[PDB]
Design a protein around this nucleic acid. Structure first.
Lengths: 114, 151, 98, 96, 127, 79, 59
RNA sequence: CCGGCCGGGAACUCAAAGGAGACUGCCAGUGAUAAACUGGAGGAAGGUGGGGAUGACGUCAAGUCAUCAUGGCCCUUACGACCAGGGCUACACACGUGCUACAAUGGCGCAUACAAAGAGAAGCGACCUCGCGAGAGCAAGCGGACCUCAUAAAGUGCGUCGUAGUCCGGAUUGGAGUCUGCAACUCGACUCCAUGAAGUCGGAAUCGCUAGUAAUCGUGGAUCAGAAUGCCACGGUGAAUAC
């Protein structure tokens, strides 16, 4: 069902089911499962609704999908409108953490075209 | 070499079955210096093949090497543009050597999930004249026969 | 008890320094044990050889600091007032632990 | 020789003990809090140039800031110059 | 009384003390099969003793350090061959043909300046 | 990135902030230092951050929560 | 021996070590372990020797 | 005390000084009866046993007036000297040297066996406590076979995942911290949470290696207030192939 996940995480292991959602990695996955009595070493095939209602309650505390993407977009646009170094490097599509633009940084900059 | 002929470093029999050919087999199949992991997959594939096929452990690799054992090799006599494939009777060291290189390269090429499965499949398919190593052996003999300008 | 420890720069200077250290105590009358080897330290130094262009060439030097341990067993009155002051070993850093 | 770098370095050596090495530990205890209070501002008044972080190790003879060796107190070509002419004790060639 | 042999294999060091008794082997205050006899280097220690057939004659107390599994077993191998003087020399004359009495000169070559390791040279440009 | 136990504001620039409590808002001040942290007690200043060739007049606002003065000074140049 | 309490940089005399009938100076003192690090300037070079508090007297 | 810890042995692992041993020397064959070669015996090792240092008369008017010295020329209230900030790190690009990957030979998690070579006093920093952690406070030993860095890693047992752009691989970006240092500000390291690009072993072409080598996995050092995939050095496992 719609357990605050982009889509149904079925046919995969319980830890992998959580990692396939936007906003939760392996650490938050083990945290949600350990604090709800889920079996981390099995798959979610034929999982009872009672153990899923506690997961549905648990996941809602930390930031959900879309609202997190909007939080990152808002945090970036704030620096863009402000006019700082982090805003200008973002609008001009170049690295901000000190990566060289001489040869590398192709992922952020873009494909080659001499 | 140029000054004198040099034969490659001789080996001793393997620690499990006492065969000098299996010692060369595990050495060629070895990767990154990990001899233990290599012999573990070789013994595992040999045991699973001897159990599945029902034949003896000796014939489980002797008949598989025999079906991929060539009887002629190619000499580069330069006739066809500075390179050629004149056939001549292969020497015994080279006879078992080319067979092991082909069956190992075929195990590397095979698309099975596990190296033990890739090896037990190539070892099974070889003895019934259907494997990739059999295709390699039964292509060089044809090319050598087609390029038999001399003998 | 008198744990003499010698530190020199040459193999043919410290065995000769501890030769008189064994003879001027054994002869006069005391209890003396032989010299303990105490492993030599090898300090390496690798530096660039060419001044203005040097990519893969280097010159390699090293120093071998030799060590010795005499460890006089009993500190008798004969060896206490006769052991040192006569070797003239200026290139041997002696150290004594009681 | 480039007298500037030598003059600056000699000045920083004395001035790095005249102000620093005694009140730097006070900055380490108070500003980097150990057990914000207003006593931190009085410990940031130290000279900017005289800081040990600015001091660069240089050769004893020519003041060369590159190729220096702390142990022998010289540069690699100065260690090589003395080493070849037998002036450094026991610095034999390494040939193991 | 006792029959001693040191033995070394490139990084390792052992003391092989051969005392009369049962055919078991004690290595580092532990059994042979437990340490590495079920894995790599299982029977290399048995090759000097296989030729003379000493199955239940002599017990070996061995203390070995340094190297790895192969290096420790090689130090035990050269220790047994050095300690094979317990009886008359008519048995080591056939052990020499096997090639284990000979000390292996196969040891690591040092790294050299300009090279990544012993003999590997850096890649040269195409043009 | 910034100092662990507190925002490091430069000594002379802190003196300028203390004189700004009494003198209020004023004309742009061309200072040379760029190593100062922004905080709620720094909002409203009209100081000019140094950027080598020139001095950029920056007006402090709420959005500059953890940034320093050096993050608004253009030092390099684009084509 | 008298004068059991010592201080750094004070001259002492060696009595139970190999440098008897001679004097020297203590470079470093360790009051916790009660051991004196004394140097004897013999042959023009420093010679670190360990001495006990009760075994020697202050000069 | 089940700890080499304590009598003792100092045998011996190891450690380090002095010697001996390999010199075509012993035999046979071959060659010219000369030098020399091949096989065998002895020996731990036979034809400079293995590796390193040591590069001839000379060559490129090869590089360094920027390590320093120096002829000539030039500046001298300035091409000299001090200070703050910035640049040396930019970006429609091309090239060299490197590192990590494309996987069941492996990923994750638990348990476990074995090193060598070094460095260390404004140091290495045990042990204890706090924090998931990076780290902080308290706090022994030693200028060194004692004390620390330092738990060696690949390997080996099982449980998991089964050929997918995946529990393969990690780029980029945001939020929140620690350490050094007046001070992380364009332009640093590391830790936590979240995001999971490209990449399915790569065209023409090209490189390194003859045995403890190639390959693979860790450790230390110089420089270093604090910062290496580079340099130097050490060992674990350990080949393939020469007609």
């Amino acid at each position: 069902a719609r357990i605050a996940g982009i889509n149904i995480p079925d046919h995969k292991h319980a830890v992998i089911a959580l990692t396939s959602i936007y906003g939760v990695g392996k650490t938050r996955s083990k945290a949600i499962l350990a604090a709800a009595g889920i079996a981390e070493d099995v798959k979610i095939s034929e999982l009872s609704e009672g153990q899923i209602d506690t997961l549905r309650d648990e996941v809602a505390k930390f930031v959900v999908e879309g609202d997190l993407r909007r939080e990152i977009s808002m945090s970036i646009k704030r620096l863009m409108d402000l006019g700082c170094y982090r805003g200008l490097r973002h609008r001009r599509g170049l690295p901000v953490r000190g990566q060289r633009t001489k040869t590398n940084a192709r992922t952020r900059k873009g494909p080659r075209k001499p | 070499p140029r000054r004198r002929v040099i034969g490659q470093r001789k080996i001793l029999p393997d620690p499990k079955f006492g065969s000098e050919l299996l010692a060369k087999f595990v050495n060629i199949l070895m990767v990154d210096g990990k001899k233990s992991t290599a012999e573990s997959i070789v013994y595992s594939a040999l045991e699973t093949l001897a159990q599945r096929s029902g034949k003896s452990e000796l014939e489980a690799f002797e008949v598989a090497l025999e079906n991929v054992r060539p009887t002629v090799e190619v000499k580069s006599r330069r006739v066809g543009g500075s390179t050629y494939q004149v056939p001549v009777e292969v020497r015994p060291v080279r006879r078992n050597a080319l067979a092991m290189r082909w069956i190992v390269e075929a195990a590397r090429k095979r698309g099975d999930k596990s190296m033990a499965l890739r090896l037990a499949n190539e070892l099974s398919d070889a003895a019934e004249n259907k494997g990739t190593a059999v295709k390699k052996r039964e292509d060089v003999h044809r090319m050598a026969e087609a390029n038999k300008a001399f003998a | 008890r008198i744990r003499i420890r010698l530190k020199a720069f040459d193999h043919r200077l410290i065995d000769q320094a501890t030769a008189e250290i064994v003879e001027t105590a054994k002869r006069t009358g005391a209890q003396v044990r032989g010299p303990i080897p105490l492993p030599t330290r090898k300090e390496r130094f690798t530096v660039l050889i060419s001044p203005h262009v040097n990519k893969d060439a280097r010159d390699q030097y090293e120093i071998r600091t030799h060590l010795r341990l005499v460890d006089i067993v009993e500190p008798t009155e004969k060896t206490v007032d006769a052991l040192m002051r006569l070797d003239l070993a200026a290139g041997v850093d002696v150290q004594i632990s009681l | 020789a480039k007298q500037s770098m030598k003059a600056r370095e000699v000045k920083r050596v004395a001035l790095a003990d005249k102000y620093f090495a005694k009140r730097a530990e006070l900055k380490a205890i108070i500003s980097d809090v150990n057990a914000r209070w207003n006593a931190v501002l009085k410990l940031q008044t130290l000279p900017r140039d005289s800081s040990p972080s600015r001091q660069r190790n240089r050769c004893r003879q020519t003041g060369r800031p590159h190729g220096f060796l702390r142990k022998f107190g010289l540069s690699r070509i100065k260690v090589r110059e003395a080493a070849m002419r037998g002036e450094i004790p026991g610095l034999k060639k390494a040939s193991w | 009384n006792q029959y001693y042999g040191t033995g070394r294999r490139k990084s390792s060091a052992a003391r092989v003390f051969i005392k009369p008794g049962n055919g078991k082997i004690v290595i580092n205050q532990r059994s042979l099969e437990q340490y590495f006899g079920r894995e790599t280097a299982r029977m290399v220690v048995r090759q000097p003793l296989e030729l003379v057939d000493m199955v239940e004659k002599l017990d070996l107390y061995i203390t070995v350090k340094g190297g790895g599994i192969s290096g420790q077993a090689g130090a035990i191998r050269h220790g047994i061959t050095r300690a094979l003087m317990e009886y008359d020399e008519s048995l080591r004359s056939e052990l020499r043909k096997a090639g284990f009495v000979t000390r292996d000169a196969r040891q690591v070559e040092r790294k050299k300046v300009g090279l990544r390791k012993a003999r590997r040279r850096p890649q040269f440009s195409k043009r | 990135r910034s100092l662990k136990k507190g925002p490091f504001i430069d000594l002379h620039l802190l003196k300028k902030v203390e004189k700004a409590v009494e003198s209020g808002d004023k004309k742009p001040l061309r200072t040379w230092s760029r190593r100062s942290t922004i905080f709620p007690n720094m909002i409203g200043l009209t100081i000019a951050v140094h950027n080598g060739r020139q001095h950029v007049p920056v007006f402090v606002t709420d959005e500059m929560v953890g940034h320093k003065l050096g993050e608004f000074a253009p030092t390099r140049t684009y084509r | 021996r008298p004068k059991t309490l010592f201080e750094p940089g004070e001259m002492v005399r060696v009595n139970d070590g190999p440098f008897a009938d001679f004097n020297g100076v203590v470079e470093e003192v360790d009051y916790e372990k009660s051991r004196l690090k004394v140097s004897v300037s013999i042959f023009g070079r420093a010679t670190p020797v360990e001495l006990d508090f009760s075994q020697v007297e202050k000069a």
